[PDB]
Design a protein around this ligand. Structure first.
Ligand SMILES: Nc1nc2c(ncn2[C@@H]2O[C@H](COP(=O)(O)OP(=O)(O)OP(=O)(O)O)[C@@H](O)[C@H]2O)c(=O)[nH]1
Ligand SMILES: Nc1nc2c(ncn2[C@@H]2O[C@H](COP(=O)(O)OP(=O)(O)OP(=O)(O)O)[C@@H](O)[C@H]2O)c(=O)[nH]1
Ligand SMILES: [Mg+2]
Ligand SMILES: [Mg+2]
Lengths: 174, 174, 179
């Protein structure tokens, strides 16, 4: 019959200890056997996987590595730590606009890179906006920016999943 | 839809979604406001929309203005600040029972007004209960009261949408 | 007609009332396993609306052990557990060092696994109440981070074992898993 195409861009978001990493890793294993694990944790799993460490400028580093042609698909862990890193790389973390600009540029670069990707992507991000509004301006800035980044990625993504207690709700499916 | 509750976390797109719903109501829209980011929605409001400021007693002011007969529909922004105003308008914001009574009365008045309203209403509220329970009694009370208010509005409303990363989930549809 | 149901949601999300409706669907004689240890307004308003045919067993820790010891599973139509949130809080505050995560995680996982076993052998159905606490901002206290992680892990286990899982939003349940 007809050969179905899987999803090109998948966003998995959820709260702390919600199973989003394991669910996204299952998605990535569905991509194939050779998976590019782009880890964003600030530094200063299946045995067939390649781990590319990249705390910032994910589009630049991932494109330069040329590894998109080497893998079956990519799992990005995680938009949360990327947004925080972007906040902490700024001159004044109490000032929102420069952090917002840098983060929006990072997310748009990632979106553009994914549009050209020959392999599919699953991205992991956090939901941080359903608690109480914090007092310090810096924490509110981080929350706002992460929300904006998730909005951008979910608009571009083909599938969006909201993890609750290890179980996925479908927020968007092609 | 006659009554729609759109609620979501911080920077979840709930305002934009409710504004598109309200634009779907018509061109003459009553923006009932209950209050960097205010200067983005002020400088974006359709000039055929009428913005009525009403920090408390929303049913009273909206009924007295007689504007229900002059507009195509209503957008309430937002139940969150209504809950906070009601809490900090109490004699002792650390005592939960009177604040709950005042807020329940406010919400029931709004519900009654909407049942008898000739135009449809879309209400925006926040989800604040899915983080860690904060220390000060006022914050816990505010969380509790907003939760109760959202429960009331969602039960009476015809359609309820839960925003995740800019995308609406249907929690209730007629 | 579900054997194990997890109802979870945020603060004041209607999860207690929804789980109580589920339990009333179980039957008329319900074992209300309460884990709170005393806030008075919550408990008062909850007890007020409790059916007089329900048996309230207060059990702050070792829920599986205590419920088995009470022998009350053979006296009721079903069980409502209120709530996994305070069960985890109790487990955290019963440790020597609440800033040390691993012993707390071990204690909570053992509690949950015992509860799971008891539910597997239970002659009556169970509806469990838990909270969502992980979608706010990452708190500062290490004890708070441990509590959040542990409750999340506990909810993951319970939802994996459960037959039906519901996520309350503003009093209305979304189905996350249905038999
Ligand atoms: N009084 C009054 N308040 C306003 C007006 N415009 C916006 N606001 C308030 O400004 C606040 C800022 O809202 P947002 O920028 O959308 O923040 P947010 O709720 O986290 O973002 P979303 O989830 O996308 O809605 C809102 O809660 C509104 O109530 C206005 O014209 N008058
Ligand atoms: N010890 C004891 N605790 C109880 C009893 N009844 C209720 N509770 C506890 O009191 C708490 C009150 O719950 P709620 O008032 O509904 O607060 P909430 O969970 O944020 O609100 P919902 O989301 O609607 O469930 C629950 O967590 C129970 O654990 C009881 O009889 N004995
Ligand atoms: Mg808003
Ligand atoms: Mg409860």
């Amino acid at each position: 019959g007809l050969v179905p195409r899987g999803s090109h861009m998948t966003l998995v978001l959820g709260g702390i200890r919600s199973g989003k990493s394991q669910y996204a890793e299952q998605i990535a294993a569905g991509f194939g056997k050779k998976i590019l694990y782009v880890a964003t944790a600030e530094v200063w799993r299946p045995k067939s996987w390649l781990t590319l460490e990249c705390p910032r400028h994910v589009a630049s580093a991932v494109g330069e590595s040329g590894l998109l042609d080497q893998v079956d698909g990519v799992i990005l862990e995680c938009v949360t730590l990327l947004s925080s890193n972007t906040l902490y790389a700024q001159k004044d973390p109490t000032d929102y606009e420069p952090f917002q600009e840098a983060l929006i540029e990072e997310i748009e670069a990632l979106k553009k890179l994914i549009r050209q990707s020959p392999v599919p992507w699953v991205l992991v991000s956090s939901e941080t906006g359903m608690g109480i509004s914090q007092s310090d301006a810096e924490t509110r800035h981080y929350c706002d920016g992460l929300g904006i980044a998730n909005q951008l990625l979910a608009k571009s993504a083909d599938e969006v999943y909201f993890m609750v207690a290890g179980l996925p709700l479908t927020v968007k499916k092609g």
